[PDB]
C-alpha cells in the first residue's frame, strides 16, 4: 500500500517534436522550460488547470536542429539550451533573446547543466567530450576520456557549500560514469559496471549519490560523496531520463514504456506511471524521454515520445 502516489493532473500541447528535456524553476514555480525535437523550445506559464496545466508563452526559434537538453537556473530567467546543431543558447525564458551562443562542440550537444550557484555551465555531447562554459561564451574546460558519447553531464548540487570541488558527473556510452573534479579538470571517480550503455545519470539533491542507467535498465546507485558503489535498481526497460526528487528519495525513471517512480529510502517502487494509451500498440507505447520532479518534487513533469508533456501531482491516500 501507500500514503501518497502520483496522479495525472494534466497535459500540455504546443509541441510537434519529442519533448527531449524539461526544466523546473524554483524562482517561479509556474514556469516550464521545454526543449523539444522540433528545433525550438517552448516556455510555458503553468496555470495548474486539470485539462491545460499551463499555456504556451514562447517558442525559442533559433536552434537549427533537434534540441536535446534544456536546464533552468533555479530562478527561471535563464534558458540554457543544448541542441543537435552543435549549439548551446542562453535564451531569456520570457523574451526569447539568445544572450550567448556556446559553439565548440564537435557533435550534438546532448547535455546542459549549470551549478546551483548558476554560474558554471557544463555540457556533454555526441563528440564524447565535456565542455564547461561561462555564461558569456568561454569554453573553459574540455574533459576527455569517454570511449563513446558523453550522454549527460550534471553539476552535483554540492553538499558542503560547494566544498572546493565543483564536481560534475558524466554518463558515457562506454558504460562508465565519470565524476569529474573541476579543480584540475581531471578524473575524480570511475563508476563502471553497466551492461548496455548509460543514457542518463542523476545526483541526489545533496550531491551524494549517482543513479545512472541506459538501455539495460540497470540504475546503478553510487555513493558519489564517498565515490564508491552502493547498489542497482533495475527498471527492465531502456532508461532515458533520471531525477531524484528535491525533497524526497523518489527516483522517477523514464523507461522505454513510461515512468517507473521508485523510492530509495525505503527501497520500493512507488508507482508505474504508464498512462493508458488508446490506439497505441505494445512496443508503440509513448514513453518519457524526459522527466523532472518539481521545485518541491510535488508535480512530475514528463516529456514523452508522443510530443506531450504530462504532469503528475502527488495525491495523498484517501
Amino acid at each position: 500500500a501507500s500514503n501518497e502516489v502520483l496522479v495525472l493532473r494534466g497535459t500540455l500541447e504546443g509541441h510537434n517534436g519529442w519533448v527531449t528535456s524539461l526544466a523546473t524553476s524554483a524562482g517561479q514555480p509556474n514556469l516550464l522550460l521545454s526543449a523539444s525535437r522540433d528545433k525550438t523550445l517552448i516556455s510555458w506559464k503553468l496555470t495548474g488547470d486539470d485539462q491545460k496545466f499551463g499555456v504556451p508563452v514562447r517558442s525559442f526559434k533559433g536552434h537549427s536542429h533537434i534540441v536535446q537538453d534544456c536546464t533552468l537556473t533555479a530562478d527561471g530567467a535563464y534558458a540554457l539550451s543544448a541542441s543537435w546543431d552543435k549549439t548551446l543558447r542562453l535564451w531569456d525564458v520570457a523574451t526569447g533573446e539568445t544572450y550567448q551562443r556556446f559553439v565548440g562542440h564537435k557533435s550534438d550537444v546532448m547535455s546542459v547543466d549549470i551549478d546551483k550557484k548558476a554560474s558554471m555551465i557544463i555540457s556533454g555531447s555526441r563528440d564524447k567530450t565535456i565542455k564547461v562554459w561561462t555564461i558569456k561564451g568561454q569554453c573553459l574546460a574540455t574533459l576527455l576520456g569517454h570511449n563513446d558519447w558523453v550522454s549527460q553531464v550534471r553539476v552535483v548540487p554540492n553538499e558542503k557549500a560547494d566544498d572546493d570541488s565543483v564536481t560534475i558527473i558524466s554518463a558515457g556510452n562506454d558504460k562508465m560514469v565519470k565524476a569529474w573534479n573541476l579543480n584540475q579538470f581531471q578524473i575524480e571517480a570511475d563508476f563502471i559496471g553497466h551492461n548496455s550503455n548509460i543514457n542518463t545519470l542523476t545526483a541526489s539533491p545533496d550531491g551524494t549519490l549517482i543513479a545512472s542507467a541506459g538501455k539495460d535498465g540497470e540504475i546503478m546507485l553510487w555513493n558519489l560523496a564517498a565515490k564508491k558503489a552502493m547498489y542497482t535498481l533495475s527498471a527492465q526497460d531502456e532508461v532515458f531520463s533520471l531525477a531524484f526528487s528535491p525533497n524526497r528519495y523518489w527516483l522517477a525513471a523514464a523507461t522505454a514504456t513510461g515512468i517507473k517512480v521508485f523510492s530509495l529510502d525505503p527501497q520500493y517502487l512507488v508507482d508505474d506511471l504508464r498512462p493508458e494509451f488508446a490506439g497505441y500498440s505494445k512496443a508503440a507505447e509513448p514513453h518519457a524521454v524526459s522527466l523532472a520532479w518539481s521545485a518541491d518534487g510535488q508535480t512530475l513533469f514528463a516529456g514523452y515520445t508522443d510530443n506531450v508533456i504530462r504532469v503528475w501531482q502527488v495525491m495523498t491516500a484517501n
Binding site: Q186, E188, A189, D190, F191, G193, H194, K227, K228
Partner: protein, 223 residues
C-alpha cells in the same frame, strides 16, 4: 587588357586549347601527357608534363628555346612572358595518354596486334592500376574495318565515377591501309586517388566491433 571577364575566360580557354592541341601534335614522340598554364609575376609557365623531356630540353639551350620562340612569335608574347618548363611525368604505365601513344608507336613499329597490346595492359596493371582498357580499331588487310579490345583489372562505365577514376584517350594511328582509333581507358586505383574519393560511391564499410567487456560488477576506481 580591356577585356570583358566572360570574353577573358573564354579566350583563356581558347589559349589552353591551342596549348593542348599544338603540344599534342608537337611532342607526341616525347610522350606528351599534358600542358598546364601558370601565370605568376614576370613569368607565364607552360609545363610540359611528358615522358621524355630530355628530348624537350635540348642541347645546352635548344628546342625548348625554339618552342618558346614559336609560341612567342605566334602569340606576340614578349621573351619571358612565355616560359615553357618540361617535367618527367610519373609512372607512365598509369598514363592512358602515354600508353595510347605507345599503342600508336607499336602499331607504327609494325609490331603485333594482341601480344604487345596485352603486354602494355599487363604493364599498366604492374603499375598498380585498378583497371585498364586498350581499343584498336580501323582497317588493316580487310576492306571491312574491325576492332579489338584489351582489358584487365576492373572498370566502371557510367556516372561521376567515370568523371573520377578513368582516363580515356583516342589516338588516330595512321597506317598504310587505314587510320586507327586507339582508346586507352585506365581505371586508376581509387586507393591511390589522393584528390577526392578513395573508393567507389558504392562503398559501405561496416566495422566489426569488438570482443566486448560485459557487466564487470561495479568495480569502482576512485581518482
Amino acid at each position: 587588357a580591356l577585356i570583358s571577364k566572360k570574353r577573358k575566360l573564354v579566350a583563356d580557354g581558347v589559349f589552353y586549347a591551342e596549348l593542348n592541341e599544338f603540344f599534342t601534335r608537337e611532342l607526341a614522340e616525347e610522350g606528351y601527357s599534358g600542358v598546364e598554364v601558370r601565370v605568376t609575376p614576370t613569368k607565364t609557365e607552360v609545363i610540359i608534363r611528358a615522358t621524355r623531356t630530355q628530348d624537350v630540353l635540348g642541347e645546352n639551350g635548344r628546342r625548348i628555346n625554339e618552342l618558346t620562340l614559336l609560341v612567342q612569335k605566334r602569340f606576340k608574347y614578349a621573351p619571358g612572358t612565355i616560359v615553357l618548363y618540361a617535367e618527367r611525368v610519373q609512372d607512365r604505365g598509369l598514363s592512358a595518354v602515354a600508353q595510347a601513344e605507345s599503342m600508336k608507336f607499336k602499331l607504327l613499329n609494325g609490331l603485333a596486334i594482341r601480344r604487345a597490346a596485352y603486354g602494355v595492359v599487363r604493364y599498366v596493371m604492374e603499375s598498380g592500376a585498378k583497371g585498364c582498357e586498350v581499343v584498336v580499331s580501323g582497317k588493316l588487310r580487310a576492306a571491312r574495318a574491325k576492332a579489338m579490345k584489351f582489358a584487365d583489372g576492373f572498370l566502371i562505365h557510367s556516372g561521376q565515377p567515370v568523371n573520377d577514376f578513368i582516363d580515356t584517350a583516342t589516338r588516330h594511328v595512321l597506317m598504310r591501309q587505314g587510320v586507327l582509333g586507339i582508346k586507352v581507358k585506365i581505371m586508376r586505383d581509387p586507393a591511390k586517388s589522393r584528390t577526392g574519393p578513395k573508393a567507389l560511391p558504392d562503398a559501405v564499410t561496416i566495422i566489426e566491433p569488438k570482443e566486448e567487456e560485459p557487466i564487470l560488477a561495479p568495480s569502482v576506481k576512485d581518482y
